[PDB]
RNA sequence: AGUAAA
């Protein structure tokens, strides 16, 4: 029993604390135009305060490829952790578990905050809206409710009476969609919990689904081979497109923030990368994960890079225009990584995996000889 | 709402340089770019440069280059601008402009692969024989330019597709000697970054392939693929050695095709980083981070390393041509440097940003050289701070102005240039006597036997002499006439003899005798040169005067009837481009005829027909009221024409042109507003400055120098001027004399710690470190200045345990920032001795301010403290701590001797807070601060801060400001945040914030009648303006700040100041930028605003700008709210002349008066400082 | 030296106009929103708020003697129904339970009270 | 006070 009244001896903790970086950045920032006026971050350890966050190495994403292990967070009770999420301004990371919790941790000791009972079934999706304003997380009971940056509960209603998959809000607030495993997508009016469209045609359970940035189109995968990915209007409820891009179940369909590029996670061990202006072709294939991929996560700085997670425990990361994977974590987990979540400033993320546990990766330091167990 | 944007300062700072032939093919020029601006700079032989040419452009120069076209008569420049756009431009004669030769567009989207944000700068590169051009564009297209209609057909190559997938471009560069242009290509396909070498260690490759220009194939020759994994840059070596040169951090590499790679390690921090062979070189333990190298010979190469280090690299070769063995000499330190280029032999020139650009010249002593500066460039650098003070000194017959008097401080430079900058827009002369003259209206100072002996002052109906020695004295004695006014007094026959015209004749003097009186329709305007004099009657009538060895002997000018001569002037060219010392008189008829006549005879060698309209080039065949041709600059090399016409002022360059005279006119442009006694008055020498004082209205001094550049420096001061005139006197040294509009006589000499030379009077105190932050004092009237010095980083704080630094001879440590806080005294611009505050080892400042806190012990509430927030930067694995420092400046008895120590700090509150400390502000006598996540209001106590509210907010707050209980948070990467205090309650509340997400740069505030506007400037060089709007339906609710103007301002602001204007509660939000320039943001009325969009829209359609480039796509933003206006657009139609407006007026259904009324109201209301 | 030269104390703004009448307020859905961040309610304290529970701003009452603990944090469910005072006052704060209990207390940087 | 010490 943990209530906060038993004597603990003050211990240092450890931190990744991003002010140094974002101070030395704004310091920069005044004299260099660019980062070809930036100067060079020697490879040695003496260099710690030559470090900025991703914005001041645009020209240069590799070194948001979190491959240095932080800490392991662990709840009391060992229940497999299902979905992870920060909040819009970074300062708490909640996750989701089998047992219908939401645990909080801090964002930048990664220390247990508060836990609360928020679900009757596992939480399966968890979303902030683009105004930061709301939490919108769905469970496998079919129900969906509304939260406050206090954790506070205030709205709660049965969209599906099968689980639910994924949520997503429209660009603004006033629209989200819902998958289920009844093989459907639904359209829903956030204020009024109003059902507005019930979007058929999958043929199977709907695994993921995924709002367009600007433009009001919903992209979903499935399980059933026939219409793995499938495109939706979602104000007139009628389907655009079928695409035909795996074999096996899709388990990730995410739009990039640019409006053209989507991203699939697939268990025939592919990641996939298509132009939505253009889909009779496939942009890129990413090989490299030996099992099934089972969660992706666009680089909130980088446009052009993400990470991908795998059903045997493996951390991949790519670029766009790269062949192979620009790194990578084999047995970052143990079992199936559920969920990927990076930091807003981009120098950390965050993996769910089937395991009982949440991890935190960051940066490599220069000078570094990376010779852990995760790296070598 | 609406607003207007202006250009206060031109920006200062160049990125690009090359030495060619700008003008012609007899000489090379240097031309300079900065971000709008393009230089042209000759060289005169001390070693002077001297401006040739300038022009601005709608858009930023990304990249720079010149070519030698075929069967061309000077070279062409390569200027890329935005996302992909090639502009060939070439020096136009006839004109004295460029002309645009082709315009190049390769912005498809095709060809940005999906990428949306673009983050690769197009860069050109010539071939050194001129064969073609190439501009990398979005890092993946090579776009080819051949060359023989002197263009061929472009296209593009896909460097993704060629025999290797070339991916992330570092450099590319075209080789020396090679049948076809080889270029080659220094990339990283497979890219790694410091923080991780140890599992991606050498990925860099260099390839070249020669373009066949007419079959379009691109082989691949000559690959090599395990370079350094941190190359930099390449250098292609000249072409008896050949290869090239490749920098990286912490080595150097020279590759040739034929032979074997020899590479050297600068210092030990390769062991572990790079596989690739390197030997030691011993002597050296540099880096080459962001160094400039350039070619001074064949094997010798000069390298300006980061620090400004200056290295001269031999290329030691032996019999057979190749390269064996390095050699480094350490020469002399110099600026920071941009930008590197190879004049003339023997001089080099050193382009900077942070700092001024110089001109050195090198010099072999007895293969080592030594350098010297011979020249620098005024650059007021990265304006990082700005503050606004009182100036410590200003006449006291100026302290009755309503207007206030104040001038800017800037943090301007970097590091080892880091400076501060005083700027002043007008000028305040120093008044050392008023003399109340009632009834005089024009004056003369005459030398006597270079000081003055004479002041005549001519009245309406008298003539006053006063005799200027020890002391001024009216001379009643004979000699010059008293009887009647005086149309014209001054030297003659080399400052020996004293010539005066009344309207009834002509008197010569020699001092205070007269010489000989010689009658004359009466005289309105006299025009005198050495040995001529010319006077022009009421109605025309023109007789000429000759000083025959002294007596003035009368000479009848052949001069024809046909139309009357209105007015006219003589000019006497000493630096010769009136070819064909010599003598000119400049004459206008009433026909709008303007006629040059050499002046020994009267021969007529130019002519032009329509003068008063303004043309803004005159060539060889209203109400005209003065005309003077004068010669400025170095040896009066500069002849400039100055025209008053119908409250209009025309100012023109003289540029050679080929028995006519082989000269032009360019129109010179100006915001000078007018709106018989002689308006243009020359000196020679005011406090060693030549050039015309113009007066009227709006009085200004025009000022032309050895560097060539025109400026045009306002004296609002003391209301409009009548009359002026130099004056070197024992107790005027240097000045010069004007009448006011009250008739008073003040006998002033320009402030000496100023400098003129500049486009605004300003003074650079070297710091000799790096300024962050300026406050100025209100109480003790003194600034306080946050610096930092780079020191070596010797220790590894833990989480505290301290780690020593231990490492070889070879290794070079890191640079660590020491920071202090300074008090600099504005009555000498020198730091106070005594008064510094040394902040702790890893302290950083990170805002200083000057805050108004409640305090009882005043006569108000608010008592104005210096408040300063710092953080503790020991790495991103140790939590980051701060402090608050509230600072108080006290007069204390001054030490004997040192007057400056009579103020010093006072440390009221210094304590840690539980968290970073990112900003402060000041809310109602409250202290506000960013500690960490929250923002905390603050109450000051006697000694101590008590807290009264916190609000949570976004991941890093860098910027607030407040206003009446109001504060405006800028985020990194979210936008605003708009913030309210309740005193009653002591609530801390969100009032709206921008929903979508944006890296702020610096915040302000719009102010109207009753509009309250939220000015953000944006990473992507915008500014954005934000209104809270409850009742719109796009806020919902009041929630979310909306955009209401839009403007891209093609620079990176980083502060503000608001001023009122000089319209009822508007005021005028200016900024400094980090190219050097200041701008101006001025509210508008929606009905003006409207009539000068049409305007805008007009002058955008039917004018041909610079390079081809619109400036309504410059000024777009990055959905845009386009609500500003471009005022530096609108200024060309005051470039335009008249017939041009009145056509362009009837176009867009207004009048040309109107358009001039809103135009020069906006030009009124921000003369500031 | 800003408002020495730019003084707005004279210009009543629209901001300042629609803050004090609340122009634009819309009632809150999903009635148990927290209200935190938010201005109080001037109407409710002056004469009347007209809303009532679903008004965006706080309706405050004076009965409150501890600082919300949770509130500190920022995560408090009760709201304008909090028990506990919602201002920084760290001379209100909450006693140290461990202090209270344990003899010392474990940080030396605690802002509850050691009595 | 709802886990402040997980
Ligand atoms: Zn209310
Ligand atoms: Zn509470
Ligand atoms: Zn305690």
Redesign the pocket.
Known sequence: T???????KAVNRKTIDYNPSVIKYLENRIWQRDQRDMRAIQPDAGYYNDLVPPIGMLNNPMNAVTTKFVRTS????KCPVFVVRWTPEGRRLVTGASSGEF?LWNGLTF?????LQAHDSPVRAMTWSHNDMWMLTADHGGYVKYWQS??NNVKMFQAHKEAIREASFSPTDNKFATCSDDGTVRIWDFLRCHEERILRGHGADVKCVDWHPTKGLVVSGSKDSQQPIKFWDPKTGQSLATLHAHKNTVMEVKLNLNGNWLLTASRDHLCKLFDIRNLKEELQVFRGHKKEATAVAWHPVHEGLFASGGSDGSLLFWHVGVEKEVGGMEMAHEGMIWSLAWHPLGHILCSGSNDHTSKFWTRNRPGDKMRDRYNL | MYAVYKQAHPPTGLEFSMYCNFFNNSERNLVVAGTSQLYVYRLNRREKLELAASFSFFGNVMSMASVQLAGAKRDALLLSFKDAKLSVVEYDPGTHDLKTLSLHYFEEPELRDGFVQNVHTPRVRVDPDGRCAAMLVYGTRLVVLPFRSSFLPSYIIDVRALDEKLLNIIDLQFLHGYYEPTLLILFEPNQTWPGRVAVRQDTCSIVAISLNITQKVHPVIWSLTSLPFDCTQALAVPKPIGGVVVFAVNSLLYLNQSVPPYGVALNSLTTGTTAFPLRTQEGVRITLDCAQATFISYDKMVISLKGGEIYVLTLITDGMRSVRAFHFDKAAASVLTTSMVTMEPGYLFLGSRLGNSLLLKYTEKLATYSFEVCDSILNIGPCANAAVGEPAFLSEEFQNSPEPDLEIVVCSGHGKNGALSVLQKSIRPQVVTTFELPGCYDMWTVIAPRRHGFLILSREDSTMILQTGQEIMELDTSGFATQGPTVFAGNIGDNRYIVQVSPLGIRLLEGVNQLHFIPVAPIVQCAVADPYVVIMSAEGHVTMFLLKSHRLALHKPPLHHQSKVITLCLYRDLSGMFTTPTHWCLLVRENGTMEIYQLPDWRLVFLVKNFPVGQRVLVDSPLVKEVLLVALGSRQSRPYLLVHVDQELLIYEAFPHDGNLKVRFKKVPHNINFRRVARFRYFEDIYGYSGVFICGPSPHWLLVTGRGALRLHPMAIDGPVDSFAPFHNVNCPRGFLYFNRQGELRISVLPAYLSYDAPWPVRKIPLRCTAHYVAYHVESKVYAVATSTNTPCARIPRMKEFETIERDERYIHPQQEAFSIQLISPVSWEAIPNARIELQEWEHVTCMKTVSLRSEETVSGLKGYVAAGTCLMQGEEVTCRGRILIMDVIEVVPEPGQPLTKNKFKVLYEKEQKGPVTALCHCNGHLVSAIGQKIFLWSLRASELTGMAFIDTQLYIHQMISVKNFILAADVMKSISLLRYQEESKTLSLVSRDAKPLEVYSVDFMVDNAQLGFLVSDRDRNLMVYMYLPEAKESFGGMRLLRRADFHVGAHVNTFWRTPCRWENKHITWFATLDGGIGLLLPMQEKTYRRLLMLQNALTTMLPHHAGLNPRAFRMLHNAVRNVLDGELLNRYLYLSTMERSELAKKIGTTPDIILDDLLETDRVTAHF | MQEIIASVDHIKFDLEIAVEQQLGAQPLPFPGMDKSGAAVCEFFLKAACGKGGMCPFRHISGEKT??????L?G????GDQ???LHEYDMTKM?????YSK?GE???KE?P?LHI
């Open positions: 943990f209530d906060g009244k038993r004597m603990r662990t709840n009391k009770v645990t220390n247990f905050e508060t836990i206090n954790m | 501890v600082v919300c603990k949770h509130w944090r995560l408090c469910k009760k909090c028990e506990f909450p006693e140290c339970y461990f344990f207390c474990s940080n605690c509850f």
